[PDB]
Amino acid sequence: EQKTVVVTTILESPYVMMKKNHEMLEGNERYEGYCVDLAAEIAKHCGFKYKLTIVGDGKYGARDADTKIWNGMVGELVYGKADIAIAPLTITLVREEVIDFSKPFMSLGISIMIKKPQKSKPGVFSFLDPLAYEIWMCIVFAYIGVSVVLFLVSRFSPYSESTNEFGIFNSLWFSLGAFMQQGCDISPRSLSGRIVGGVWWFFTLIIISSYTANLAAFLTVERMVSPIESAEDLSKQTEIAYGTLDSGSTKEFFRRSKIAVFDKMWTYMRSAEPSVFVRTTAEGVARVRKSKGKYAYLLESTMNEYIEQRKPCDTMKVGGNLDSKGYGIATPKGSSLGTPVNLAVLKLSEQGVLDKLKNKWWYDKGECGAKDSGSKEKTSALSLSNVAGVFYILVGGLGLAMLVALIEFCYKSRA
Amino acid sequence: EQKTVVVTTILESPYVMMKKNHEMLEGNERYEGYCVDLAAEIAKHCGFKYKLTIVGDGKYGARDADTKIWNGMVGELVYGKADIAIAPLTITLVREEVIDFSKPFMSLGISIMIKKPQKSKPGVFSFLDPLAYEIWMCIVFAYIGVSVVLFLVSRFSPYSESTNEFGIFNSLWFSLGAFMQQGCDISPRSLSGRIVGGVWWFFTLIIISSYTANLAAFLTVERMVSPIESAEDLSKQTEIAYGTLDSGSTKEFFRRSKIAVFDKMWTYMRSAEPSVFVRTTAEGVARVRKSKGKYAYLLESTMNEYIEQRKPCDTMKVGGNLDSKGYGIATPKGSSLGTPVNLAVLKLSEQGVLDKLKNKWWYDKGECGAKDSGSKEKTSALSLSNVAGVFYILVGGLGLAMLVALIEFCYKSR
Amino acid sequence: EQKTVVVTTILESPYVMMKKNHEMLEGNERYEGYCVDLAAEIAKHCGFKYKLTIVGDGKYGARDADTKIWNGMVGELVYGKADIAIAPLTITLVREEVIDFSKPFMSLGISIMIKKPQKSKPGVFSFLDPLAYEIWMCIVFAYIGVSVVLFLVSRFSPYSESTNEFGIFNSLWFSLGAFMQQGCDISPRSLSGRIVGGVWWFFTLIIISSYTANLAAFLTVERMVSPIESAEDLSKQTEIAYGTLDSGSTKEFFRRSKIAVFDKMWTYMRSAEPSVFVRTTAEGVARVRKSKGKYAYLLESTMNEYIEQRKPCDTMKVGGNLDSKGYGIATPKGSSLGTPVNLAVLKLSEQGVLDKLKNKWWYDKGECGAKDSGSKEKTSALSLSNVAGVFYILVGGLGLAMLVALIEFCYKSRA
């Protein structure tokens, strides 16, 4: 009988996660996730029994401080503690020097995580907005003042009281009709009444003109620039602190890179204090979430798009990928598995099972994915939900007017 | 033997700034800055080891009158206490007489620093602003012309007619109602009157449609005014005092100058009290901040533009450069360093390292809103302070209407 | 006795130019310009007598093509043909290695020349512009059609002709008052007259609104972008061909430079065909001017800003300076003249005479003082020259109305 394969892996969602009944299930059954499905498929094609394990120290693998010793997941392969690795492990030159990688099974880049700056919800009565509350209150007091002054001037000695129609109720209707610019049925024929009319016409002209001009702005623009994605412009500021994972390939990439913007970013990240780095990706996400949008974490696009699709969905991804990298299955130098694993990965990609495994785990759970991306269009029509408050005011006014008419009729009959 | 060289240099930002480690570390770690980088680049081209030392008295200096003794920075070179000087130090003829300068590495002029006024609120009568004054005159004259012509055309005594109700006062009211885009109770009802009406309606159509285009942006202009710009007005007044660094090249420039405006400014500086000079630049900048805008300081554009980047950014540059001068490395007469240092300066300027260090020290470290404030998203609502001017003329008109009514009544009653 | 100094120079405006009477004057008097003044000042300080000459082959000069020989200005200094050079000779490392340069007397950078895309003058009747010629004519025919249809319907059997006031002249006034949205005496009281009225009201609502909306666009922002500065277009497209002077420091700078965009520009300029280079600056300027704005020339700011003053003032400078360089007086290695000449240049700069020379030559003869750069503030008020056409139409209409009234009165009297 052949020896069982000692597979080794790392806990990371959705690649590997705990089963609900891990307290009672068998050691293999405790694990479920994307990598467990892939491992079963590869084993079924190659034909070996296998036993799962979790890496003893939870680090993806990096090179120690010139001691030439390797951290946990690469070390477990190199020092012969494990026989194969199946995990989200990136293909890099320094790893290729010591361990043999298959062809990639997924393609990915580097991406920024940020906390979303809320969403504005206009009220029912939004049309009131382009003028402040104090303006509406002062317009009401001005209307009452003009109405009573015009009555005092008109129904006061022409000597002859008949001459002027402007009782109170008519002066109040005249000034209301004047403010709406909806035309008139009488006009004053006296010097003092004409000066009060002409001043009210000027006030109306300026107030209505400025109201309709501002409306345009409020209804022709509604967007916010947000923190710029361009990493050079991110480097140009210190209000936000950004950091990578500890012992991850992203950190080695920033260390090794000599591109001027990336060298500047590494120079900041090496010299900045306190420690911006974290031990786990979930700790990085939580530290962004708690830090009131003041801190950022650097993480790779396949994990980013998973987190973006999970509640509470308060995160945003900005900008494109900075690079392009593959994940591949790794096996220890000079080992028989390397060729059949290569043919298995090719065959699975050629049938298309790998898309089925991604769909099953990433997007099937994408609860917030309903049309959240929106559009950048600038000529959208208005929609009835924006207007309804005016319809509610109109129908309430028709109800009130009909009630007043009925009580006036009943009183006039009884009186 | 490759002995270490001694550099003499002065603390000034961002040329030479104390690093926080300096309590813990040796002097070459203690300091960082643009001059430290440049000194490293020059040493790496020339190939020698170097030690950085601070000039004892902290003065660039000039030869004292009637004693003819040079003070600190020039003295260190002339008296052989240092091998080279690398600091912001200006090329001048009096120094060229005794020490050898490389080709200049940066160019600078003399500039005025002032404490900026806060942006002013727009005026009370802002609503009239979108149209020029000549338009409002021509509008008034057109209104008078139309009103009198429309009176003259009616009431023409045909071969008795009284149907044309357009007396002068009613014609003047009809024209006013037509311009405000308000309805009126009478209309011309004769051919010539209908021509005059139609033409006034077309004129009105254009005027309004070109004043209501942008009325809210003019209510929210947000900024205006500056106290001085000419860089000459300081010569004409004594209300604001202005002062230069002590012992600096700027002071010698003003002393030597025979330009009339500069000679007048020196004569003021030679006689005004209490002393306008300061012992360091930082003392001058602080004095400008404290003096509530009553005092200005004269300093060279690299300082002005650096200080403008740095918080709190309450200080600002106005006007152009008064003259053009270069900074250059200084070396002691007949020393062998002169030619390899000079060729190193040329090579570094041709490669462009000096531009990279300029951007890195001056401009990357900016923090105030001058770095970017151009988004100008839509101004929310429209507060009462912007509109209050229209309420005052309304209530004045109501008060006048009551006064006119009361005089009319009391006259009619007796 | 003294030995006359052989000064050598190059013809280039405004540094050196031909005197009007060069056919009759002495060989020294034939020349006048900024450098002749400077040369007289330096000679008056140093005290040597001098004789002017013009460099034979007329090139500033650069290291020859692997013959290791030097061309005209540097060669005439090195090989002992001349004793001093006074010209806009740029300080550069390769020249400093063989000849000695004084401190710089003027500062310059590299700048781009482009042909200005003309200007548009608004007409007297600009307010007509937000619509098209064909729309105004069709609005006139629609007004006539509605007027006559409304008459045909109203003054046609109510059975009673008195019932309708809408004779032709009243229908024509009613429809005019309707189109201005200015209100009117009377309204039709019949079904057919009300349908024709309501359709004319709808047409008026849509047409007027559009005009006032588009007026805003045509009344708000008017500007032109021009080709992008800083060689962005020149690096990113081949549509514009850009040349530099031959045997000039600019060409050596582009050859030597290793900055990525500058290296790309040199790679284009070396490989591009036909030859973009020129022998003289005036030829480069002329080649830009004739080439309908399709060709560009690279030249340093003192020339660019001088040429902007010159007629026909159709050139524009775009972008900032690319670098920083000085001109210095040059003297041949070990020559005694270098020590006093350097102090003379310092003294002249320290008194400020060089500013006076620049002001006199560039600015005081800069009589193209139109200074069309203007201002960029968007909140600019309207000006009477924009409006006057409406005032001319108003006053002509008042004159016509008053004449028609006089002829109607005279006919009424004679009839």
Ligand SMILES: N[C@@H](CCC(=O)O)C(=O)O
């Ligand atoms: N896939 C990454 C995980 C760590 C990171 O995102 O930097 C790796 O192999 O190192």
Ligand SMILES: N[C@@H](CCC(=O)O)C(=O)O
């Ligand atoms: N660079 C100047 C500093 C003092 C000043 O700005 O006047 C000098 O050499 O003295």
Ligand SMILES: N[C@@H](CCC(=O)O)C(=O)O
């Ligand atoms: N000032 C330039 C002239 C030639 C050019 O503009 O390229 C030089 O000294 O070479």
